[PDB]
Design a protein around this ligand. Structure first.
Ligand SMILES: Nc1nc2c(ncn2[C@@H]2O[C@H](COP(=O)(O)OP(=O)(O)OP(=O)(O)OCC3O[C@@H](n4cnc5c(N)ncnc54)[C@H](O)[C@@H]3O)[C@@H](O)[C@H]2O)c(=O)[nH]1
Ligand SMILES: Nc1nc2c(ncn2[C@@H]2O[C@H](COP(=O)(O)OP(=O)(O)OP(=O)(O)OCC3O[C@@H](n4cnc5c(N)ncnc54)[C@H](O)[C@@H]3O)[C@@H](O)[C@H]2O)c(=O)[nH]1
Ligand SMILES: C[S@@+](CC[C@H](N)C(=O)[O-])C[C@H]1O[C@@H](n2cnc3c(N)ncnc32)[C@H](O)[C@@H]1O
Length: 263
């Protein structure tokens, strides 16, 4: 046969617009960004409004001890820097280094003055697939591009998995990696291998939209991957074909404050 996630991806692509858009936000957690937008507009950089939604995503993991940034932090595919700035707010972090592709169709790093910004250093024009690995205490990675093909998503995920190992072999004991397509059998066996060597486990962040099955490979987690995935697949499938769409659960975004920090 084929995996539950496999079937999810097929059932997903067969939905109408009205159904899709309505489904992808059903029962999910969502951050209110409207004030972030206002700040952005006005150019206010010291109101603690994150640069993206991803800040709230990482916060969700961190607060549940799934990952706990420490020492030198490296954020691969940092984009605007939601994850980088958030790591810089934490007392145990001393150095935040981010890398992202930039250019056409890609998010450029964004300057904010959230608490700790001064130890953040983001660099654009960098393709992590050709960037020599560096030492780190914490390794973050949030790379992964959607596609209506699960096979595409598979190989994309596999390329990512292949490359993150090199960064991990450098001894960071705290980590968080986006697995774009975790439900595919080749991805699973690869994670099964990587889990044996590096530990950790896979976790679904409820802030992620129902239109994607992304899970995060995190060092503060553990346990059976194949079960973990399937559970998420039953939830996501369980949300389909709904009667009265209740919509998302709105939460307040994280406040990263302002000002520098001496290290
Ligand atoms: N190459 C393309 N990328 C796109 C397109 N539409 C959206 N995106 C990007 O996908 C990403 C996911 O979109 P989502 O809306 O979920 O991103 P976030 O929710 O994390 O950003 P928010 O700031 O919370 O609000 C989202 C957006 O607000 C816009 N935004 C937010 N910040 C900016 C800046 N700095 N410069 C230009 N536009 C910005 C942007 O269009 C996003 O859709 C995001 O980086 C977008 O820039 C698109 O049509 N083409
Ligand atoms: N039945 C349908 N299925 C769809 C449809 N669109 C996408 N999909 C399926 O859902 C999957 C994911 O959908 P989504 O696009 O919501 O993916 P994400 O939420 O993970 O993308 P994000 O980057 O998190 O933000 C999403 C979006 O931001 C926009 N975005 C982001 N990147 C881009 C680019 N490069 N170009 C144009 N627009 C872009 C776009 O409007 C998306 O809704 C996708 O792989 C498809 O299998 C659709 O219209 N109908
Ligand atoms: C969506 S962002 C992740 C969000 C970020 N963690 C945050 O909190 O805002 C992922 C980024 O990885 C970048 N990316 C994709 N492929 C890359 C590559 N090969 N090398 C470096 N960055 C890449 C994309 O430009 C994209 O903006």
């Amino acid at each position: 046969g084929r995996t539950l996630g496999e079937q999810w991806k097929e059932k997903l692509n067969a939905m109408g617009k009205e159904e899709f858009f309505s489904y992808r936000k059903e029962a999910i957690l969502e951050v209110d960004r409207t004030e972030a937008r206002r700040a952005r507009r006005e150019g206010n950089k010291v109101g603690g409004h994150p640069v993206s939604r991803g800040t709230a995503k990482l916060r969700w993991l961190v607060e549940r001890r799934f990952v706990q940034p420490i020492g030198k932090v490296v954020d691969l595919g940092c984009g605007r820097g939601g994850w980088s700035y958030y790591a810089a707010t934490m007392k145990n972090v001393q150095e935040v280094r981010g890398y992202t592709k930039g250019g056409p169709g890609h998010e450029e790093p964004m300057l904010m003055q959230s608490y700790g910004w001064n130890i953040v250093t983001m660099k654009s024009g960098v393709d992590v697939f050709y960037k020599p690995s560096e030492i780190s205490d914490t390794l973050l990675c949030d790379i992964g591009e959607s596609s209506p093909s699960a096979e595409i998503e598979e190989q994309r995920t596999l390329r990512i998995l292949e490359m993150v190992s090199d960064w991990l072999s450098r001894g960071p004991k705290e980590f968080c990696i986006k697995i774009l397509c975790p439900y595919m059998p080749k991805v699973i066996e690869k994670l099964e291998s990587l889990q044996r060597r590096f530990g950790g486990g896979l976790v679904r962040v409820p802030l992620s939209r129902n239109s994607n099955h992304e899970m995060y490979w995190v060092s503060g987690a553990s346990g059976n991957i194949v079960h973990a995935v399937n559970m998420t697949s039953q939830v996501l499938i369980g949300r389909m074909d709904k009667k009265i769409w209740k919509g998302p659960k709105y939460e307040e975004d994280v406040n990263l404050g302002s000002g520098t920090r001496a290290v």
